[PDB]
């Protein structure tokens, strides 16, 4: 299929109307960030020549 | 930068070769329409909100904080005066209460 | 197509697999970059049919209905001003979909300010939104409201100067 970007949401804009929140949600989200890699050492003489 | 929504706090957690941030954020919800105006015309003076916004539920005008609906009476303590009503486009007529008025009235 | 060359090439091992894997990683990384930059909203916002923004003109940045590509005049100018076993993979997001993402971002930031980036899109009049931005930089709302026509004229002039500068500089 041809992918859809998102659901269409036409915001009801007018020159004298505002939308004010009456409630709230305390949302906890996860963010995973890599920090380090495995510390690998290669003996060049032993790798090439044994 | 610290999660989707208005960032409140974050908590770090260790992970194998990594870190996991639990971002605690504030998300607005249950929004409601209101009729808004840039300024309030009272006694030939233009009043602007000190920290909030003017909202109307249909018949009465209030001032509320921008991120949560908490309507309060439009007074001189939460508004400031700058100029007359002839300059601001879209200024509406409403009364502005004075807390000092019953003090010298009594 | 030489069989003998491939037979001799097999003596060197998995170099070809490494090179193909690295190129595949770069190719998927480009699509990931485009997703990270442009696909930050899951709602496709649209502007109202009446462009009443209190004197502010956004015609040079909003999509042009007359153009089949649905690009802005600035975006159209930008696209006009940029000119043996090898294959070029097409990008996952085409130019019209990227333009649609930018249009959604523009509609959200015009009709809702910064509210759509933090949650549900809350409508606000554009002069009031500009006044909020003025308060963000430490200038009172009254200054914005009193000089609204001047600010709108300056903004329109600056946007036109941006289009002229892009069209006139190689
Ligand atoms: C604020 O008012 C607007 C306009 O009256 C509402 O927008 C309409 O909502 C209905 C109900 O879903 C839709 O069928 C219409 O298509 C909407 N019109 C537009 C132009 O978007 C809006 O829902 C109201 N918001 C609240 C929170 O009550
Ligand atoms: C704001 O939304 C919260 C949702 O977290 C509402 O809390 C719920 O209220 C209903 C009705 O009393 C209860 O049945 C739920 O158990 C409540 N949920 C939680 C998590 O406590 C709250 O009432 C809403 N407030 C307003 C003014 O709409
Ligand atoms: C807008 O809100 C105000 C204040 O909440 C409403 O005024 C109140 O209306 C009730 C219903 O009759 C009265 O009992 C209160 O005494 C009123 N308070 C004041 C200060 O007048 C007003 O009716 C609301 N308007 C709409 C259209 O909902
Ligand atoms: C808001 O109040 C002002 C001031 O009372 C009104 O301006 C008056 O309008 C009438 C009729 O247009 C004129 O005869 C007066 O001379 C005006 N007075 C001033 C000081 O300008 C204004 O019309 C009111 N607006 C609304 C919507 O009620
Ligand atoms: C917004 O700006 C656009 C372009 O800056 C205006 O479109 C111009 O309108 C005049 C008068 O009709 C024409 O002579 C120009 O050729 C138009 N320019 C382009 C690029 O089409 C537009 O009128 C302005 N105002 C509104 C409300 O959209
Ligand atoms: C909004 O636009 C209408 C015309 O559609 C106009 O009559 C009204 O005064 C405008 N209000 C503001 C606050 O600009």
Q: Which of B28, B39, B46 sits opposite C120 (nearest CB)?
A: B28
Method of determination?
A: cryo-EM
Residues C62, C51: Cα–Cα separation, whole Å = 11
Write out the DSSP string of C45-102. Answer: EE--SS--STT---TTTSPPTTSTT---HHHHHHHHH-------PPPSS-HHHHHHHH
Torsion angles phi and psi, residue C117, rounded to 5? -75, -15
Decide whether any atom of ligand 2 lies within 6 Å of the A23 Cβ. Answer: yes
Q: Which of A18, A26, A31 sits opposite B21 (nearest CB)?
A: A31
- The CA–CA distances, whole Å, from B36 to B63, C121, C133 equal 10, 17, 17
Residues B40, A22: Cα–Cα separation, whole Å = 23
- The CA–CA distances, whole Å, from C105 to A44, C41, C102 equal 53, 7, 5
Between β-strands B61-64 and B53-56, what pairing exists: parallel, antiparallel or unpaired? Answer: antiparallel
Residue of C nearest to A15 (CA): C125
Q: How far is B5 from chain C (nearest CA, A)?
A: 4
Ligand 1 centre distance from Cα of residue C106 (Å): 20
Torsion angles phi and psi, residue B41, rounded to 5? -90, 120
Cβ neighbours, 10 Å, residue C52:
12
CB C121 within 8 A of CB C109: no
> Is B16 at the interface with chain A, CB within 8 A?
no
Beta bridge partners of B45: B42
Name which of C118, C134, C153 to mutate to probe chain B: the one with the most chain B Cβ atoms within 10 A of its Cβ. Answer: C118
- What is the DSSP-derived secondary structure letter of residue B10? E
CB B43 within 8 A of CB B76: no
Location of structure tokens 């036409």:
A10
Beta bridge partners of B56: B35, B61
Write out the DSSP string of B24-61. Answer: EEEEEEEEEEEEEES-EEETTEEEEESSSEEEESSS-E
Ligand 5 centre distance from Cα of residue C113 (Å): 24
Phi-psi region of C6 (alpha: psi -120 to 50; beta: other; left: phi over 0): alpha
Torsion angles phi and psi, residue B75, rounded to 5? -120, 180
Residues B38, C148: Cα–Cα separation, whole Å = 12
Q: How far is A16 from chain C (nearest CA, A)?
A: 6
User: What is the maximum alpha-carbon separation in chain C?
Assistant: 82
Task: Tell me the Cα Rg of chain C.
Answer: 24
Residues of B in contact with A35 (CB under 8 A): 17-19
Contact C119 B88 (CB under 8 A): no
End-to-end distance of chain C based on CA atoms, in angstroms?
A: 44
This structure's resolution (angstroms)? 2.8
**Helix-strand-coil split of chain A, %, nearest 5:** 10, 45, 45
Residue of A nearest to B70 (CA): A22
Atom number in ligand 1 closest to CA C48: 20
Give the sign of the dihedral formed by CA C39, CA C43, CA C47, CA C52. Answer: negative
Cβ neighbours, 10 Å, residue B37:
21
């Amino acid at each position: 299929y041809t992918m859809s970007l998102g659901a269409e949401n036409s915001v009801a804009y007018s020159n004298n109307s505002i939308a004010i929140p009456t409630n709230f949600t305390i949302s906890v989200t996860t963010e995973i960030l890599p920090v380090s890699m495995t510390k690998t050492s290669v003996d060049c003489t032993m790798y090439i020549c044994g | 930068f610290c999660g989707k929504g208005y960032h409140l706090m974050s908590f770090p957690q260790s992970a194998p070769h990594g870190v996991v941030f639990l971002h605690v954020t504030y998300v607005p919800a249950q929004e409601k329409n209101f009729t808004t105006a840039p300024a309030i015309c009272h006694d030939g003076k233009a009043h602007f909100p000190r920290e909030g916004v003017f909202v109307s539920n249909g018949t009465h005008w209030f001032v509320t904080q921008r991120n949560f609906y908490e309507p309060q009476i439009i007074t001189t303590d939460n508004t400031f005066v700058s100029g007359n009503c002839d300059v601001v486009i879209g200024i509406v007529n409403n009364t502005v209460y004075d807390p000092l008025q019953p003090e010298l009235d009594s | 197509d030489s069989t003998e060359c491939s037979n001799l090439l097999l003596q060197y091992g998995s170099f070809c697999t490494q090179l193909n894997r690295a190129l595949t990683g770069i190719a998927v990384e480009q699509d990931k970059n485009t997703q990270e930059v442009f696909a930050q909203v899951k709602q496709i916002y649209k502007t109202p049919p009446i462009k009443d923004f209190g004197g502010f003109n956004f015609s040079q940045i909003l999509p042009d209905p007359s153009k089949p590509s649905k690009r802005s005049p600035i975006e159209d100018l930008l696209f006009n001003k940029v000119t043996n076993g090898l294959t070029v993979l097409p990008p996952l997001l085409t130019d019209e979909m990227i333009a649609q993402y930018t249009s959604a971002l523009l509609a959200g930031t015009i009709t809702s300010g910064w509210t759509f980036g933090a949650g549900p899109a809350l409508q606000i009049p554009f002069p009031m939104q500009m006044a909020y931005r003025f308060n963000g930089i430490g200038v009172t709302q009254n200054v914005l409201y009193e000089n609204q026509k001047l600010i709108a004229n300056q903004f329109n002039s600056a946007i036109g100067k941006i289009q002229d500068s892009l069209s006139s500089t190689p």
